[PDB]
Amino acid sequence: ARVTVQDAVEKIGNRFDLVLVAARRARQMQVGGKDPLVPEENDKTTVIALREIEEGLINNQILDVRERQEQQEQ
Amino acid sequence: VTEFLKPRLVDIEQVSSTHAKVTLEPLERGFGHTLGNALRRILLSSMPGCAVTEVEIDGVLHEYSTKEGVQEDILEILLNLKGLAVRVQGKDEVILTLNKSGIGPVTAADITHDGDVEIVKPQHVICHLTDENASISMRIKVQRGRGYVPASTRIHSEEDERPIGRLLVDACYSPVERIAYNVEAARVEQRTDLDKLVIEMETNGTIDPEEAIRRAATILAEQLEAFVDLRDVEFDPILLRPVDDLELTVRSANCLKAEAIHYIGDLVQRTEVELLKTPNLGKKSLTEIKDVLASRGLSLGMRLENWPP
Amino acid sequence: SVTEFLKPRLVDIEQVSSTHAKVTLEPLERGFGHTLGNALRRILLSSMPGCAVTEVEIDGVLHEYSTKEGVQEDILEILLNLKGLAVRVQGKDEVILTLNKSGIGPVTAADITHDGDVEIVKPQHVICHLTDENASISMRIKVQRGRGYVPASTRILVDACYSPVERIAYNVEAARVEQRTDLDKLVIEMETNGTIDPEEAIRRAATILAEQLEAFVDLRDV
Amino acid sequence: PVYQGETTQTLQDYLMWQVELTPFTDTDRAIATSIVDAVDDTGYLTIQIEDIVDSIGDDEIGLEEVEAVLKRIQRFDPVGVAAKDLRDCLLIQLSQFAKETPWLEEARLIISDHLDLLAN
Amino acid sequence: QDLVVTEDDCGTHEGIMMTPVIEGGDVKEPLRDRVLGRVTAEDVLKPGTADILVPRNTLLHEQWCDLLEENSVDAVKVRSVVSCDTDFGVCAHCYGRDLARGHIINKGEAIGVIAAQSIGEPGTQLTMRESSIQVKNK
Amino acid sequence: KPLVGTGMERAVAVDSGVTAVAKRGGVVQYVDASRIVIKVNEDEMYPGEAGIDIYNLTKYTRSNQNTCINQMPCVSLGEPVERGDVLADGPSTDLGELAL
Amino acid sequence: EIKELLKLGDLPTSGQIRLYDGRTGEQFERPVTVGYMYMLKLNHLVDDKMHARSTGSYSLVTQQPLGGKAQFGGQRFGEMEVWALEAYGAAYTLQEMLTVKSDDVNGRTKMYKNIVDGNHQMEPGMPESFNVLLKEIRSLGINIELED
Amino acid sequence: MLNTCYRILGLKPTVIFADQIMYTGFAYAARSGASVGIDDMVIPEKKHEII
Amino acid sequence: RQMLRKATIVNAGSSDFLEGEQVEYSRVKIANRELEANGKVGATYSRDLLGITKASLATESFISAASFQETTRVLTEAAVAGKRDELRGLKENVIVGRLIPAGTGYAYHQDRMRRRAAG
Amino acid sequence: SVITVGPYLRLHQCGLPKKMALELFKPFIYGKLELRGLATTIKAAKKMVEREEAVVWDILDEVIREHPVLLNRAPTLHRLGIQAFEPVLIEGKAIQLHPLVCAAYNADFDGDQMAVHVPLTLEAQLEARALMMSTNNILSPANGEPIIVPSQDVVLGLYYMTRDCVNAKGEGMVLTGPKEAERLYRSGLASLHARVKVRIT
């Protein structure tokens, strides 16, 4: 559970594309196929995506590398 | 030094039928308020007592209708019966009948007297008669409760037991109706200076003051028993029918026994594309399985979260 | 069922430190709430067996305001700092203790002479903050077994705090069990000075409250 | 003005509404509409079953394939919708009933056969 | 409504001059909250010559205004939205940080929508409406 | 009843055309939840008439805003009523005065 | 006269009185005025205006729901609301509120399907109001058509 | 105070301070028991003379 | 800034048959002309203030020019000139219902404008 | 629904009536029942929702656990008229509202009609949580000043609890600082006791 978003805004900095990077991250968890790295506390994926982003583990660059690796390994 | 002192129930005063003042002389300083305010609210929040739940009158069908021979229509009679104080001994539910015929008003005393039913207010009028050929016959149900329970709550409580000719009213179940307290310097002088509180109350008449006080004390003790010791420090999927009676045509049973297929559960959470990856069973067999599950498995459309044994 | 009231089935008690407490109860019957909360708070705050310092016979001017004597510590802060010093006594009554140390610097609670009847929850409690290493100082303090909280104006040097608690508060929230969706839940947040576990303090308060009334109940369930 | 001509459903759109919610594949969905569109408003379907196979325009698809898709709908909003030839309708309605019914087997026995006499 | 942010820096040096407002008797609004929100220009010099306080591109983050008040500066060169070094829209180093976030405004924000609405929200106004010299200070 | 009071509440209530009045008020003989009869005295009556007046109360009748229009009686039995006095009390009324 | 009538009734002439607390059980230090005033009930209640919906019936023109308190009606989303959203970044929320759940016929059905399934995606498509507008403009001597 | 708090300490602590301030203000306003009476206002005695 | 647009010029600037053109277009034109080949043939612009209610009609996106004024009029205008809107204004993306470039979606439209040259 | 007040809520909550629910999050409850296995088909879930059993309320509580909602008032001049909140189920027919955010909607608690919108897609929820959430916009977009500032009752309480007198009950004595709360709920000190020395960190 998280109230503020400022914990994750400083990572991106722009805050104008934070919804976009959080959309592709949560879409995977919503459609099925990926597992959340951060342990869940009975919360919706829409909050889990932001909680993982606020940890530095998830961003716009890492997700592209992961997608490229998944595409090359298939 | 611990063990200051303990109060004693003494000096009970009964001024009138309603007004009564109970006093507790011995108590330690800084306890009168935390005792009076704690007893007062518990006494007023919940208290057993009897009240009118429903009334059924022969002539009148619904409260939104007038009756001949009586001065008032049936709207205020229910409101007067709502505040009708009465005690019940032994059992809980009674069906007491009220019958009368004359030219004068109907009080609460001219009623069918029962062994357990006792009327405390005989001068409580219920209606007034204006015709010589006027007669009123009704049946009232009285039970016990704790707090205020409206009629809308008991509407859904009765599934289908609602014939025509019996209306329901709101119950009070609070026979206290007035309680207050006050502290003042006591008379003990041999020991340290102390005080005493007196519980004053205007009651409905049904319950007794000392009994109500001891009951509130018992409830407070049973509630503090949950604070004395602190920690000393069903939902399931409906489709669970066995794998039988599924009309195994050729190799459905063989595939279910070989692949360790569950009874009916795991077969529903399967896609058509992944099912073809299994060894060759036959398109005809697949269509037969689909047609059979169209009545039991429901087109194999479901994606559940977990499947416990 | 008009005589069986809903009781809390679960009692979630969690602490942050050794003296902190954030006890959370379960939804009880509708209406108890603030009544039970305030009753527990009043019982654990108004009167509670304990002990503290009542006065000090310091080696100096008997007046409350005196010279610093080269200690750099205000005489008013000395009387205030001696108030927050929890004392543990097994069964002894009011007893006088003393201390004597050179000018090593800060005066801790361990500087008091060791007695079998007096125990200190923390020897690291500072009494004096500075000294010029020239002359010593004698406290000559005294503790007394009492209850409640009596100030220094009514008692006729230092007001004693017999209450072993430091802070107490309650909060009432909402909690649901069934379609009724109307029940009271109480959360008790407290802070203890020491020598008494907060859970144990709540237990003692509950026992005192239950024992406070035993005759007006007329010995129910006999 | 008054161009607020409120629209509705009624076992054509409502029947179609349920179609989407359920998990039917492209070939099955397509077939579903064909049979869900031949359902006369009065009660049952118009054309026969074989008709429907011929109006798919296929050769690999047999009656069995369409049977399921046409069997699955038998249990939708109004149990008994798109039944065809009376008997099947009534018969199905007795299937969703509780098997702990005293006259379960009797009724079923006189539903599959000996209907003419009953009619008399 | 057609004003959108699509550039980072305008790359201009026009700027404007910012001075406190004074009307006859005293100052109504000093130079403390009128230039704080926006970015100052390059021509920012201390009262003492041959001495600089802040560089060319300096955003007032509520810490340099106190130092400017200590030195008692009267005229401060500040850039505004009258800059023509832009194709369609305004850059980010021009609007300042007049937002509820506290940091510099980012690209894609609707300045045109926030404005013309923040000035229209207060709809509580009412309709239908030489020899003497006296001073307090000298 | 408006214990505070503001003035001609009785007048407003009797002139609002919502209650029933007693024309040629004599003696009351029969009272009921929907019917009230009044026997007019010999002075306030003209020959050729029996000398009784009947009032049929309005019980739970709809209004232009789905508000029930109920009426209530005021005399119990055999009470002398003068001319112009209020006999029945309608909605938002109490003993002839206005009570909103 | 009011102060005299108050003193007559054996009560403080001022009018204020010290009230206690019904929750904690303490007393208020400042006296509080008490008395019996007159209250009037009004017609506007909450059980007569409260209504909500997710899917109902829409009109034949532009396929929009009803506004008034029909069996199931919505509320007009005016320009003052979208002007608030354009200064936030609700472009996606605006995109899902303008076509998907208001005008688009296949869009609302596909959204309902995706929410029942648990996919939570959106397909913009094209609303019906723009098509109605194009059809109304083509009715005169004016040509207009969508290009690429 | 809240302005300086948002400026210095941050957003989340500011929100916490704000809700706590609201809580304690409601509590102390309930505990106080402020009321307005007819005695709470007094006409100046020199008013009639000024008139 | 939304009032001091549509400036006027006095020189030809390869636009001698135009008086009172948009400020942006003229500026960028000069920026491309004085640098590419030669800046001798330019236009000395004289900015002239303009009213608010008169500036709202100066929109290239005719679709976002109807609700703000007498629609039919603008319509006839667009029937006489025969121009294209290309959906450059937010309001136009609202009327069409497309994803507007404001706040977050602005990124999307940026990408769509960046990769439009290839396809 | 009519707007009321709530003193137990926080800056990012709103009282949503249970009766207003079960109709708005209807496709969500349908999907929840379909995934939990308690709903074999769609008609079954619809029938269970129409009967309003005990299980659908728990399913609704589970679904609305962390699903953001947004509120809107009819007169919305500035952008603060549309904010987002975390819905909390409360028994009743009126919508509760935070006292501090009231100034944002410019209400006077004579409750008018309100509007409650539900974001369906994931990106809409993300935007409502990161941009439209009340805990993100604290200052005003017109002058950069805080608008969530307390109101009359809070101001009055804070002004009454901070007031110095001349001769209070038990003044002059020295206090530790966290001990002042203890004597408040007792009779050893007044809240308006001036000339009192107490250390603070």
Short mmCIF file of C-alpha atoms in Angstrom, two decimals, chain B residues 1-9 24 28-31 33-35 37-39 41-42 45-48 144-148 192 210-211 213-233, chain C residues 1-8 11 13 23 25 28-36 38-40 42-43 46-49 145-147 180 186 188 199 202-204 206-218 220-221:
data_model
loop_
_atom_site.label_atom_id
_atom_site.label_comp_id
_atom_site.label_asym_id
_atom_site.label_seq_id
_atom_site.Cartn_x
_atom_site.Cartn_y
_atom_site.Cartn_z
CA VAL B 1 -0.86 0.58 49.63
CA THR B 2 -3.04 -1.51 47.31
CA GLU B 3 -6.59 -2.75 48.10
CA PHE B 4 -8.08 0.67 48.88
CA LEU B 5 -11.71 -0.39 49.50
CA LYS B 6 -14.73 -2.03 47.86
CA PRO B 7 -18.25 -0.59 47.45
CA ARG B 8 -21.36 -2.11 48.99
CA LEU B 9 -24.95 -2.07 47.75
CA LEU B 24 -22.86 3.55 46.83
CA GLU B 28 -11.82 5.52 46.48
CA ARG B 29 -11.05 9.03 45.23
CA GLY B 30 -10.92 9.26 41.44
CA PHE B 31 -13.40 6.42 40.94
CA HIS B 33 -16.94 9.55 37.86
CA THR B 34 -15.29 6.63 36.06
CA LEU B 35 -17.87 4.38 37.74
CA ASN B 37 -20.31 7.40 33.60
CA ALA B 38 -19.36 3.79 32.83
CA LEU B 39 -22.50 2.33 34.43
CA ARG B 41 -24.02 4.43 29.32
CA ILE B 42 -24.09 0.62 29.61
CA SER B 45 -27.17 1.27 25.63
CA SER B 46 -28.49 -2.24 26.25
CA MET B 47 -31.12 -3.45 28.71
CA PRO B 48 -33.60 -6.35 28.57
CA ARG B 144 -38.10 -9.36 24.81
CA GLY B 145 -35.08 -7.61 23.36
CA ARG B 146 -32.18 -5.31 24.10
CA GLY B 147 -32.24 -2.25 21.85
CA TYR B 148 -34.27 -0.34 19.26
CA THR B 192 -9.15 9.16 54.57
CA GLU B 210 -31.08 -2.86 41.69
CA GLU B 211 -31.51 -5.69 39.19
CA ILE B 213 -27.54 -2.13 38.22
CA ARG B 214 -26.28 -5.62 39.03
CA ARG B 215 -26.91 -6.73 35.44
CA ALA B 216 -24.91 -3.78 34.11
CA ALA B 217 -22.12 -4.63 36.57
CA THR B 218 -22.16 -8.25 35.38
CA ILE B 219 -21.96 -7.12 31.75
CA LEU B 220 -19.07 -4.75 32.56
CA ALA B 221 -17.21 -7.57 34.34
CA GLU B 222 -17.80 -9.99 31.44
CA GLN B 223 -16.51 -7.29 29.07
CA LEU B 224 -13.41 -6.63 31.19
CA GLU B 225 -12.72 -10.38 31.27
CA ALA B 226 -11.64 -9.88 27.64
CA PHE B 227 -9.05 -7.35 28.86
CA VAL B 228 -7.80 -9.29 31.90
CA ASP B 229 -5.89 -11.71 29.65
CA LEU B 230 -4.45 -10.30 26.42
CA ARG B 231 -3.70 -13.11 23.93
CA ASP B 232 -2.02 -15.10 26.76
CA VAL B 233 1.27 -13.36 25.95
CA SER C 1 -29.96 -14.14 22.97
CA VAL C 2 -30.47 -11.04 25.12
CA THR C 3 -27.87 -11.95 27.77
CA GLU C 4 -24.87 -12.93 25.59
CA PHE C 5 -22.99 -9.91 24.24
CA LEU C 6 -20.43 -10.13 21.45
CA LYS C 7 -16.89 -10.24 22.82
CA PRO C 8 -13.63 -9.62 20.94
CA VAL C 11 -6.53 -9.42 20.24
CA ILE C 13 -1.10 -6.46 20.22
CA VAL C 23 -2.87 -2.53 21.08
CA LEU C 25 -8.93 -4.81 19.65
CA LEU C 28 -17.20 -5.40 20.28
CA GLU C 29 -20.92 -4.74 20.74
CA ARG C 30 -22.23 -1.43 19.44
CA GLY C 31 -21.97 1.27 22.10
CA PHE C 32 -19.24 0.20 24.54
CA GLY C 33 -16.43 1.93 22.64
CA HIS C 34 -15.47 5.25 24.20
CA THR C 35 -16.94 4.14 27.53
CA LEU C 36 -14.54 1.19 27.87
CA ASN C 38 -12.09 6.13 28.87
CA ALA C 39 -12.68 3.72 31.77
CA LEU C 40 -9.39 1.90 31.11
CA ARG C 42 -8.97 6.68 33.83
CA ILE C 43 -8.15 3.55 35.84
CA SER C 46 -5.77 8.42 37.89
CA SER C 47 -4.55 5.85 40.42
CA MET C 48 -1.88 3.17 40.09
CA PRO C 49 0.58 1.68 42.61
CA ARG C 145 5.56 4.00 47.84
CA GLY C 146 2.40 5.74 46.64
CA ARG C 147 -0.30 5.95 43.97
CA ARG C 180 -25.20 -5.12 10.04
CA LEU C 186 -10.95 0.53 20.08
CA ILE C 188 -5.10 1.83 22.73
CA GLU C 199 0.77 -5.32 28.18
CA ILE C 202 -3.07 -3.08 30.78
CA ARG C 203 -3.50 -6.44 32.50
CA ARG C 204 -3.07 -4.88 35.94
CA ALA C 206 -8.08 -4.62 33.86
CA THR C 207 -7.66 -6.68 37.04
CA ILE C 208 -8.06 -3.56 39.19
CA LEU C 209 -11.19 -2.54 37.27
CA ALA C 210 -12.73 -6.02 37.56
CA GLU C 211 -11.84 -6.20 41.27
CA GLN C 212 -13.12 -2.65 41.87
CA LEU C 213 -16.71 -3.97 41.79
CA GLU C 214 -17.31 -7.40 43.34
CA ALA C 215 -20.31 -7.00 45.70
CA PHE C 216 -22.76 -5.05 43.52
CA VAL C 217 -22.64 -7.97 41.07
CA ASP C 218 -24.14 -10.06 43.90
CA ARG C 220 -23.52 -13.88 39.55
CA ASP C 221 -23.17 -17.36 38.02
#
